[PDB]
Subunit: 260 residues, 2 copies
């Protein structure tokens, strides 16, 4: 893609005030002004720790180079005990939100349409979004990779305007490579990213397709980030476990070099 | 109940930094030392606003009289994007957590067993819990109130030790009468509260049954709180909409005048 390389660190349900202070300081320290010009860096933080991370970044020399993202959001205010609304994120000056992550689609049964509604409400409120898509092991075995991803994308596109895509980062999760014993190769990852690019080109426009960053959201570590970054349609990463270690995350952020 | 009157204000999915600052200050202002001796006051806050509420309370004269509770919590750390686990609440010094609220049991399909699991890990971590139970309209007309409530309670008891019950406050939600058009009378509420007490007495012990506070968690407001507070087994309230108004909330807190 033609978009600026973007690396997000999804901390998932991990962290303590102490570990997060060390991590946040390490992440900010790794992205100075010069590097920030070539890579957008985002950290996905558990709701309760967002204020702490914001506080830490405020005191860091490179704090402005690290953007805070929530890991989910709800779209209805009122009688929904336990949920954090999109509006609360905006109220708290959180610029990003990760939506439709495979863990929420599977464990919390978020459907294509429910994810699309979240994306729609989030963007309408001004949030930028990392929208997660991807097929399961069963779906890939059934050779439904393209059909499944297309359906996920269509649900999202049907809900928003062409202009709304300007805030969207897509993250491809090869769910079929998650605890299955099957690892996605750069070639396999690129094959799906290429088709996502094609889907956007066919249904929206070539311009939107090329402008939209498609992050690879499979297993990313310091040992495979460069090989993956070499792929034409991988415009960044949504890192899992490795994002909890500032040193590992640093190596991944720097793999943007493969694009220069 | 022989337990201390306890009033929880479940803010659910509502609030902004501005509205919460005004509300928190109003709630704290409404509970001085003398009233605090009669009523334990808890506020259920959206995850992202917990730090703010904590900060506000620390700066108010009566701040120590108001306890902060989360509105939900996940079982543990790990690959659960969007979730906040019990350990994070303890790490942030949050003393309470509301679990099994009807909105989560119905909307997010939390089963009796799943809720029980959460209660168990919450208490293991050191949290105090407001565990919600209650039957639907379909279950009530089918005359299954006792069996349904018994099953919800059994799931919880099966997962924890006798001593773990010290940390538990039960909240009965007459789901069949919350915004349905049906009004739960004080007599109807007392009847279910009595049976909850009876269930604990036969399934655990009379000591635990009497020590465990049973809050009424149906629709509570300034107009109906006193008649409910007069009931022998209504040891407090878990207030919904009315908790977003300091004046209405303190009116409800003061219904403890029916106890003394």
């Amino acid at each position: 893609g033609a978009g600026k390389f973007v690396v997000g660190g999804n901390w998932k349900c991990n962290g303590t005030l102490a570990s997060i202070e060390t991590l946040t300081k390490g992440v900010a320290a790794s992205v100075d002004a010069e590097l920030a010009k070539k890579v957008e860096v985002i950290v996905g933080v558990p709701f309760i720790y967002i204020p702490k991370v914001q506080q830490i970044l405020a005191g860091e020399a490179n704090g402005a180079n690290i953007l805070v993202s929530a890991e989910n959001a709800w779209t209805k205010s009122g009688a929904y005990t336990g949920e954090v609304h999109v509006g609360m994120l905006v109220d708290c000056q959180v610029p990003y939100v990760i939506l439709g992550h495979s863990e929420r689609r599977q464990i919390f049964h978020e459907s294509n349409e429910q994810v699309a509604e979240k994306v729609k409400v989030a963007i309408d409120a001004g949030l930028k979004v990392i929208a997660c898509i991807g097929e399961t092991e069963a779906q890939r075995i059934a050779n439904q990779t393209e059909e499944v991803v297309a359906a996920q994308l269509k649900a999202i596109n049907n809900a928003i305007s062409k202009e709304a895509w300007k805030n969207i980062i897509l993250a491809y999760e090869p769910v079929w490579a998650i605890g299955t014993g099957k690892t996605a190769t750069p070639d396999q990852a690129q094959e799906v990213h290429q088709y996502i690019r094609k889907w956007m080109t066919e249904n929206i426009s070539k311009e939107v397709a090329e402008a939209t960053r498609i992050q690879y959201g499979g297993s990313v570590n310091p040992a495979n980030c460069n090989e993956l970054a070499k792929k034409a349609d991988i415009d960044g990463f949504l890192v899992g476990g490795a994002s909890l270690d500032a040193a590992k995350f640093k190596t991944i952020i720097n793999s943007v070099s493969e694009k220069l």
